[PDB]
């Protein structure tokens, strides 16, 4: 028996910014009070990861990275009454503790007790659960899915379906739901729209398989990497352009092509010039951008108000909008009644000991989604 | 006796920026098809047209500005169908085409005929109605109503009540209507909501009024002027801060007002930083911010795009985003039964040969609607 003990186990920490992983053993603590340890079964390597290697996203080191995962309870602390051990489970990077004004809002979704805003790399309680060589390790978003197990609080964590394939569902945690909800939750494609995507990673194929799915006409996918074309044409979109194929910018060739500006722009890439670009492409009067994208630590873009001024909506969202713990075990219901398709994201599977060559995969340009098996 | 004929008449012609406009003769033609000659009633004085004589709102010069008024047609040209002479009209400085994709648009109003994005100071035909000197003077915003006697064309005009009282409604044509849509449309404004807005002139007067209709339960006046306070809690502010009263920026001392952000913030000032502080003070998961004021020409703002990533709504508009020749009429029709106040935005009337005065008064600080009677 493993409950109630300290767990040594094999992580994957990340030591300073910009150096590999190492793949060392740990040890992990038991759950305290309303905390839940975990068995992972499958992680993805998500962009948002390599950001924490880049230095794009700040936040404290050493950690135990990985948000995007999927595994199967090992034991509960005192006062866990959401899961049970040998569930089915995801960790939600944003958490839902149901008691702020965020998650009491009907369309809210970043929870306060969040660790995006102001990054501790900690559990709820200030500590972590984590040492390596006699190190503490932090946490990350207070999830830390590059380990054979974790320990979350339980507002960070859902319940899925028994039968759920957790190789498959972990991108529910992430790239997926991201995607998908910033499409039709948050963006509210119409039927019949125009949409661009700037960006056909894993995060900008999942926003147009929701601007799919809401009806939209025309779904153009904008891309500096042409390799990316032929997988986001398979998921709905309807034409590419590559920047680097014209003499003028982008915002000019789309509200050409969409004869004055699209509806729907997404920003999925995560740099200040293309937000404001997919700002300036959707119509003047009624378009509306999404920012999907994380923009590089401290650094402020630079735009006109006469663009919001005319009638342009500009918002953002982390996790699609999505409230996370009532979401999440709705989506993988959705996937296991063949409501969407999380095959076309997934690339590349590798063992969890081959994280930096999956790393390397998303670097080079060559992956959308490496799944990492435990 | 005068259709078909040259008028002449006074008008306020502004030959130079940063000047007084000088009162003064002009010649103004007859319409051709598809235009309107209005006899001017009453005109009101709007910040938006100090923006024309400081350079904050570019238009070519000598022009002939005014777009907020109300009049009595003289004349129509061949083919109009939507007014006759006698009739009461309010001129449209936003059109309404009815035939563009924004004009289709269930949401859009900022008709694609607009001379507001790229000024040229014309009518639609790309022509001059208005002659000063043996000078050709340019149109605003195919408006130009400091004049006695304008010329505008078909969808920049709606027939009113024959019953309006000119000398109020005038204020339907903008100050009033930006402001109270700006809130219920634009925003949309919740019962029950706490509302920040900055700047407590007419347009933010109205935008309180706005608010106060939506059913807000608070709703906090910003401004600089501590004389402008008392006139907005009587439309409806509960509070109002000063930001040269606090140590700490403006943003910060709302976010604590509000117990952690405001859930609709208004900019209606015209300023780059107000509008990024407008922004920062909603709630970073839910907020909705709307910028109203009119920024200098040419000018960017900087911002922090996280403040959109957490899941901040930011959004502009003109006129209250009313489609205007559908929604004039309605809204004075609602004034006449008394649905919402003009009076509190009228704090000085003059003859329009006291225009300079008008603007004296505005510049100082102590008006905020001087209504203009030719
Ligand atoms: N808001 C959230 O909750 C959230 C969640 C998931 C991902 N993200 C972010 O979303 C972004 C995309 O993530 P991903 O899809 O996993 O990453 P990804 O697989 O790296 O995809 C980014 C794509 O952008 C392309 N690209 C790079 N530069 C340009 C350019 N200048 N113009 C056009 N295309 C360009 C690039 O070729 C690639 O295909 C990242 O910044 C993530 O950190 C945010
Ligand atoms: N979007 C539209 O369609 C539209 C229509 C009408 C007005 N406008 C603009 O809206 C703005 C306000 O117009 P208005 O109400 O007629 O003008 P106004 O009477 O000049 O009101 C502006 C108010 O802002 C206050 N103010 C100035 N600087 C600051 C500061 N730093 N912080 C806080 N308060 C400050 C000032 O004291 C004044 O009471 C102007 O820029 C107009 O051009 C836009
Ligand atoms: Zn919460
Ligand atoms: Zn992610
Ligand atoms: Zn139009
Ligand atoms: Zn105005």
Redesign the interface.
Known sequence: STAGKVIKCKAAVLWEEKKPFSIEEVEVAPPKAHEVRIKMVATGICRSDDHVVSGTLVTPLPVIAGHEAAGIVESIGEGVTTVRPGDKVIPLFTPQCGKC??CK?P????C?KNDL?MPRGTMQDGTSRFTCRGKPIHHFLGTSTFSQYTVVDEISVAKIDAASPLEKVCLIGCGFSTGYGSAVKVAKVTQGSTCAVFGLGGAGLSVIMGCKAAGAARIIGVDINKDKFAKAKEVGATECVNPQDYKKPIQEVLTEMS??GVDFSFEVIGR?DT?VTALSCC????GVSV?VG??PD?????????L???????????FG?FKSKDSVPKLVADFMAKKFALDPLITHVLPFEKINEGFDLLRSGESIRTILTF
């Open positions: 004004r965020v809002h369309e809210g979704n970043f306060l805003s004869n004055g200040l937000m119509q003047e009067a009624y920012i994380v923009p401290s650094q402020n873009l630079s735009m006109n108000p006469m919001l001024l005319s009638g342009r909506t500009w918002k953002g969202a982390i909008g």
